[PDB]
Amino acid sequence: EPVNQFTGYLKLTDNVAIKCVDIVKEAQSANPMVIVNAANIHLKHGGGVAGALNKATNGAMQKESDDYIKLNGPLTVGGSCLLSGHNLAKKCLHVVGPNLNAGEDIQLLKAAYENFNSQDILLAPLLSAGIFGAKPLQSLQVCVQTVRTQVYIAVNDKALYEQVVMDYLDNLK
């Protein structure tokens, strides 16, 4: 019943925190009010983070998303829609980052991350990671520059996490 039980994070900024953990396991531990999905414009929740979140909801996320698409049509790259979080969180903010492997512009990560500013506290993966083709360190940099609300980033990437920690240490004054 208590929500937003975030713990074990490294606060890169007063806004952005990071933890090396699987996002589905982290949603179970933290009970977030909002989880971000790394969606495509058609809300076809397969592969990567979207497939993992949809599977955790036993396909309830996909059923609701299919209803949303039938009534409202697809999203735009850089856009988002707020839907149920099902058993992962109260709400799911489906955000579409650019797919560099589809030739979409990496700069659309600024518009994509700006959607995070519509919720106060969020659990999120890094956008455009996996086969979306953006280097996760670059996605994290856009996140730090753009997000103004409280975002808790879950990464299942030891190489990335350790480099982020080293960058944090180098930036200490």
Side-chain angles (χ1 to χ4, degrees):
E1 180 131 296
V3 299
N4 302 326
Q5 302 292 295
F6 297 107
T7 191
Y9 282 78
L10 166 57
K11 283 272 184 174
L12 298 175
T13 71
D14 66 344
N15 222 278
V16 178
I18 192 166
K19 184 182 179 178
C20 195
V21 61
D22 172 74
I23 197 171
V24 171
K25 295 253 186 187
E26 182 64 10
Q28 166 60 219
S29 314
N31 192 26
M33 285 289 289
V34 177
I35 188 167
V36 169
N37 180 30
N40 53 61
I41 62 166
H42 301 290
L43 298 183
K44 287 181 170 176
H45 309 305
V49 167
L53 300 186
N54 182 48
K55 179 186 178 89
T57 76
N58 292 122
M61 179 178 284
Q62 190 64 64
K63 191 270 179 184
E64 180 197 22
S65 294
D66 287 346
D67 292 343
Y68 175 95
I69 294 291
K70 180 72 177 177
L71 271 50
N72 309 113
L75 299 179
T76 301
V77 180
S80 74
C81 67
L82 194 287
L83 290 173
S84 173
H86 298 277
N87 57 304
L88 295 159
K90 186 179 174 181
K91 296 159 277 172
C92 176
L93 181 68
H94 294 268
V95 178
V96 181
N99 184 336
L100 281 58
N101 286 136
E104 300 169 357
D105 190 355
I106 195 180
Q107 303 310 131
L108 289 164
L109 272 174
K110 177 180 165 75
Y113 278 117
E114 181 62 39
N115 292 285
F116 288 26
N117 293 328
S118 66
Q119 300 284 335
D120 52 1
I121 303 162
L122 312 89
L123 171 59
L126 288 172
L127 299 178
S128 298
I131 62 169
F132 277 65
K135 294 171 168 60
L137 229 23
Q138 303 197 171
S139 181
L140 176 63
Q141 282 157 185
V142 181
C143 181
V144 167
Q145 292 301 304
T146 306
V147 184
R148 305 171 185 241
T149 56
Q150 297 291 310
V151 61
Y152 288 86
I153 299 291
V155 293
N156 51 328
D157 191 330
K158 177 66 156 176
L160 169 66
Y161 179 81
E162 291 307 328
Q163 180 66 53
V164 172
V165 172
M166 283 287 283
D167 291 349
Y168 168 80
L169 301 175
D170 290 346
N171 288 349
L172 285 182
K173 299 291 188 291

